[PDB]
Design a protein around this ligand. Sequence first.
Ligand SMILES: CC[C@@]1(O)C[C@H](O)c2c(cc3c(c2O)C(=O)c2c(O)cccc2C3=O)[C@H]1C(=O)OC
Ligand SMILES: CC[C@@]1(O)C[C@H](O)c2c(cc3c(c2O)C(=O)c2c(O)cccc2C3=O)[C@H]1C(=O)OC
Ligand SMILES: Nc1ncnc2c1ncn2[C@@H]1O[C@H](CSCC[C@H](N)C(=O)O)[C@@H](O)[C@H]1O
Ligand SMILES: Nc1ncnc2c1ncn2[C@@H]1O[C@H](CSCC[C@H](N)C(=O)O)[C@@H](O)[C@H]1O
Lengths: 339, 339
Amino acid sequence: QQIDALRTLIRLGSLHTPMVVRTAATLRLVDHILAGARTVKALAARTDTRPEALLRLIRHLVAIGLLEEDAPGEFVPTEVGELLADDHPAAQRAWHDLTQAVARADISFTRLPDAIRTGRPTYESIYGKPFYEDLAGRPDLRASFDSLMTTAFAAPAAAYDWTNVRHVLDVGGGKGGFAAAIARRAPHVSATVLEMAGTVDTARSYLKDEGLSDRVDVVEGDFFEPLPRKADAIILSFVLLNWPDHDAVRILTRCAEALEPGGRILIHERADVEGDGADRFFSTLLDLRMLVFLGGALRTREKWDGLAASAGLVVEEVRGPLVSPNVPLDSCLLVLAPA
Amino acid sequence: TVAARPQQIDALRTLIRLGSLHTPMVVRTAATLRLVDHILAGARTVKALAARTDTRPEALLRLIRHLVAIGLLEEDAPGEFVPTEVGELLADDHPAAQRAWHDLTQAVARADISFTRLPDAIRTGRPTYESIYGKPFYEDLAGRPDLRASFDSLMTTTAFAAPAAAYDWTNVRHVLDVGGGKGGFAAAIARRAPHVSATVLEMAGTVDTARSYLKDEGLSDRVDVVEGDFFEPLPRKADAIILSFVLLNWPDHDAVRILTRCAEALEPGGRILIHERADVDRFFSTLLDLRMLVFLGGALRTREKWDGLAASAGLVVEEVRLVSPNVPLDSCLLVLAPA
Ligand SMILES: CC[C@@]1(O)C[C@H](O)c2c(cc3c(c2O)C(=O)c2c(O)cccc2C3=O)[C@H]1C(=O)OC
Ligand SMILES: CC[C@@]1(O)C[C@H](O)c2c(cc3c(c2O)C(=O)c2c(O)cccc2C3=O)[C@H]1C(=O)OC
Ligand SMILES: Nc1ncnc2c1ncn2[C@@H]1O[C@H](CSCC[C@H](N)C(=O)O)[C@@H](O)[C@H]1O
Ligand SMILES: Nc1ncnc2c1ncn2[C@@H]1O[C@H](CSCC[C@H](N)C(=O)O)[C@@H](O)[C@H]1O
């Protein structure tokens, strides 16, 4: 009765289990196993690890249900464990790779009390630069982050009607997947992706390869500055949660000043609601991630109305639960009009 | 179109739970802020909680949301949070001391940061603690008396009566508890066999806490305490020399160094008693074993590994007695004799 509470709490507060997974991801272990390395001796060679040490790590991967000893000395991935394959469409190996952007950013959680004391992010205290200024100097991290955010925008593009939309402006649109999804849904629409340096190059590649350059262009810029052009739909897809309140209102005010008459601003975000249930585990992961990464947050409908009002907008409507293929969390789309 | 397959989303939701860094650090933050003690002391609103914890209220409520989601807190009344049964273990007076084991300002939860560089320990085989805090574990503690004290308190959580009944002290006159901590093992023995005297061999600072604890137990007359280094010649000889949760702190060559010192300190017909978990719930065995890796380059050891280590120091494993208290992990007692 009390040992179960004791076993639960130790298990909840255990730091070695998440880091065992992340180490297994960074080492590309499941890939090497599926590539024919069953033993510790071969796996340790492929992963350039000490065999004694690798086995102790494997012992825990077996214990938490990711690896299984099928035949003596041979380890294979379980059903959950196969999701650590590098070509799995959930991209969970890349999400737990300590060399890529997100899992490297998750070290900010080691200083959570600081962020709770101040409400301000800890990523800078660990890595010396705020997140996006750090990506701007680390082309490997900029590259790996941009590919993670693309893990296809089909549901959010169907939740809007484009018939009288002429141009679309995807502010912070990453690689262009949302803009490309729109262009595939409405052949008359042209779009522009306003993105950061480095990201603009891979946004132009993806749109070229989609065959859509003749319709979706890319502008490198800053969305706290005057936006490059006016549009009938200004898209904010997973941007505003990166930002404290005054910075989100800044972005919105810039998006409002670029709205054509009858235009709209589209916030495509997870907005936490009170009665999620078992869905709160992943809402709180994102929200806390936004705190320690950047000082941003997930917002409720009440908060958006205040943000929109501060930016001279108003929340017309929210389109219901939007389901994406390989996420644990549905998102939604808020339609904003001039106040 | 988008296709949401539950069995995939369940395994995906499972893996994210396993690799998530925020759940353990949320717990660790709750323990360091002493959140459960404050709620018990009459702070129920997040306002009073933030005032007692000196945190930003909006940031504290976002931490509580995950605490509620992982089942350590529940919302009795709106804005009113209380510790669940599992969460009650975070109370500082609880006998499992779980809040202190998760206190980021105390020794163990602080040392757990070594896990953030686990791939380094798996690639190279020895600890990462020094690369984070500037010194190997016990040298760090010698310069931080708060951590020295904090660690010593933690290790005291029976009071060693369980493995004390496992040895027959009839023909033991004096006992040397090498690295004996506060003296609980010495005291547990002394309280069980009134003829045996004892000498505890410990480090600076720990000698004071051991000395004072052995006086408040009515035992200064019987158990002596000597400050020393067990890599050096032991201060005197004994009929039983205890190594209780010492050798797992050390790689193979340092362990045979300690064992040699004990064999050289043996009275004729004397024995060396190793008190540890002999590697064979695997979840909690792996925590200690991997902790000993990233903390100190140590490890749990199977019996066959003990035979080699014993031989290298001129010892032989005489018998292995499986103790079974009520903690997650059961300890064993290896008896070692000269060859
Ligand atoms: C919340 C669950 C979710 O599935 C929802 C959504 O897919 C999402 C996630 C993660 C992130 C971002 C997302 O939008 C994101 O924008 C972001 C960012 O801008 C800057 C740094 C990290 C992140 C980041 O880690 C997913 C997740 O697995 O963990 C939080
Ligand atoms: C097997 C694990 C166990 O559950 C049971 C066991 O009592 C034990 C634990 C923890 C520690 C030590 C233990 O012996 C221990 O000796 C030690 C040490 O010598 C030096 C530094 C840290 C530690 C340390 O953190 C418990 C635990 O909570 O997980 C490891
Ligand atoms: N100051 C700034 N100006 C322009 N873009 C910025 C910016 N600060 C952050 N960003 C961009 O905002 C994006 C947030 S991630 C959003 C990606 C994409 N819109 C999607 O829905 O998947 C990042 O790609 C980052 O490059
Ligand atoms: N070089 C050294 N000489 C003497 N003691 C040492 C030492 N290096 C580490 N130690 C001690 O080894 C102990 C390991 S923790 C074990 C404590 C006690 N035997 C128990 O069972 O609870 C620590 O108290 C630490 O102070």
